[PDB]
């Protein structure tokens, strides 16, 4: 289930910057940076949980992780 909702990506970016036009297929690289963001977030979260000896991912893990990874996601 690796197929991306391209229209959706286009709409999200539209929502934030309605006058930005994405050229052909650039949405595919945007989606790629998103997958890499969630990959990083998944790894950071899992590490937090591991640090707690928590056998499942909890909100506090993802919260601290999101803070770290969003910082890493700056342009």
């Amino acid at each position: 289930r690796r197929t991306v909702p391209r229209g959706t990506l286009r709409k999200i970016i539209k929502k934030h910057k309605p006058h930005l036009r994405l050229a052909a297929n650039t949405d595919l690289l945007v989606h790629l940076s998103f997958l890499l963001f969630l990959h990083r977030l998944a790894e950071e979260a899992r590490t937090n949980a591991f640090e707690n000896k928590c056998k499942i991912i909890k909100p506090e893990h993802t919260i601290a992780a999101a803070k770290v990874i969003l910082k890493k996601s700056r342009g």
Binding site: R21, A23, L29, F37, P59, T62
Partner: protein
Amino acid sequence: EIASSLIKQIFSHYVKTPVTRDAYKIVEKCSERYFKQISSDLEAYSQHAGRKTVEMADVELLMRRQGLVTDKMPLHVLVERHLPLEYRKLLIPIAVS
């Protein structure tokens, strides 16, 4: 405004271990924040190049700024590693290697 099912499936696919409902809702929030942040960055790239479009070079620069694209880890490799064939075809119709 991205589908929560897709986000849960990708996220679980990467995290590989069970996640609470609330944790997932957090990941969704973080995802919305991610798109807001990058939207502003791509605007800077475009506006700076004096154009109204996002170009491949813009998003590559993004990913380079994120520590993702490096000399050791070029974009084509991230594409090959992480995207399905039909997408790679579009992005790399000829080897850029």
